[PDB]
Amino acid sequence: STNDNIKDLLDWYSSGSDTFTNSEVLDNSLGSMRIKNTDGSISLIIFPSPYYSPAFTKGEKVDLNTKRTKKSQHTSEGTYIHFQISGVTNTEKLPTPIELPLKVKVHGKDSPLKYWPKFDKKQLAISALDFEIRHQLTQIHGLYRSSDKTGGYWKITMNDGSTYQSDLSKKFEYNTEKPPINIDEIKTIEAEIN
Numbered sequence: 203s204t205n206d207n208i209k210d211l212l213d214w215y216s217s218g219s220d221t222f223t224n225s226e227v228l229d230n231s232l233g234s235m236r237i238k239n240t241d242g243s244i245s246l247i248i249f250p251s252p253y254y255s256p257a258f259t260k261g262e263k264v265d266l267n268t269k270r271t272k273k274s275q276h277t278s279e280g281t282y283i284h285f286q287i288s289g290v291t292n293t294e295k296l297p298t299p300i301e302l303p304l305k306v307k308v309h310g311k312d313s314p315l316k317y318w319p320k321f322d323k324k325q326l327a328i329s330a331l332d333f334e335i336r337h338q339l340t341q342i343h344g345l346y347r348s349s350d351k352t353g354g355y356w357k358i359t360m361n362d363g364s365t366y367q368s369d370l371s372k373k374f375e376y377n378t379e380k381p382p383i384n385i386d387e388i389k390t391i392e393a394e395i396n
Contacts (some may be wrong), residue, residue, distance in 0.1 A: 204349050211373060212346035214269075215336040220245075220286060222266040224293055227258045235290060237264065243274075243282040247290060251379040254327070256290050264290050265323065267330040287329075291382045294324035302388060304335065308343055308351070308395045316342045325382040328366060331358065332374045335393055345370065345395055356393040358383075370395065 204212075222239045229236040235256055237245040247268060249255055258264055268289030275283050299320035306313045318338055335356045339345035346352065353371040360366075360383070368374055 204346070204352060207371075208346050208352050212340060214373065215333065215340050215346070219289075219330070219333050219337075220266060220268050220270055220284065224263050225266055227260055227262045227264060229260060230256065230258055237266070237290070239266075239284075243284055245284045245286055247286045247288070249288060249290075250377045254288070254379045254381050258290070263293050265293050266290060267323075267326060267333075269329075269333060288376055288379060289327045289330050291323065291325045291327055295322050296324055296386060298322075300386060302385060302391055304338070304391045304393065306339070306343060306393045306395070313343050313395075321385055323385065325384050327382045328379055329374055329376060331383075331385075331391075332356070332368055335391065336370070339370075339393060339395065343395060351395050354393070354395040356391065358388055359390045359392075361387050361389050 222245065225237045225239045225245065227235060228238050233249055235247050235249065237247065239245060245266060266286070266289055268286040270284060271287050272285045274285070277283060299322040301320050304315060304318060306315065315338065336345065340347070344351045355367055355369050357365055357367040366380065
């Protein structure tokens with residue numbers, strides 16, 4: 203049996219993420235952005251962190267690799283609105299897609315990856331990297347599904363030695379999220395399930 207916190211995390215990381223490329227900025231105020239997607243929908247995205255406050259101005263193009271906070275709505279005016287959190291980056295692509303070095307250990311023993319995607323974007327928000335890492339863990343490695351896989355961490359080590367890390371027993375700390383990083387500067391990503 204697992205506790206209620208672990209159940210919320212299983213629901214959160216087992217659903218998917220929203221992906222929109224080449225969207226256009228309509229408005230950008232403190233803590234949010236109103237974006238128009240190519241398919242005609244509108245995205246209302248919140249940015250709770252003072253360290254990651256997108257500075258894109260009206261008219262600029264951006265990419266979305268984000269998560270919805272609630273069900274989308276059809277309004278009176280007939281617009282389709284998405285409610286998402288974080289995940290806005292520039293539209294730059296890498297010369298050729300790369301494979302991010304992810305090594306996973308479950309109870310100290312190595313656990314091989316299955317369906318770990320390649321990435322063609324130059325920069326990804328840290329919350330998006332968090333979603334991808336944890337999603338692979340819940341779908342392929344059993345994270346949050348039983349009581350013996352409820353904690354651990356993931357750690358990204360950059361070429362200069364600086365690191366980013368998240369505790370798997372808690373939801374990603376959106377309120378203190380750091381700015382998006384260039385994925386081609388990541389030396390290693392390790393994930394351990396206790």
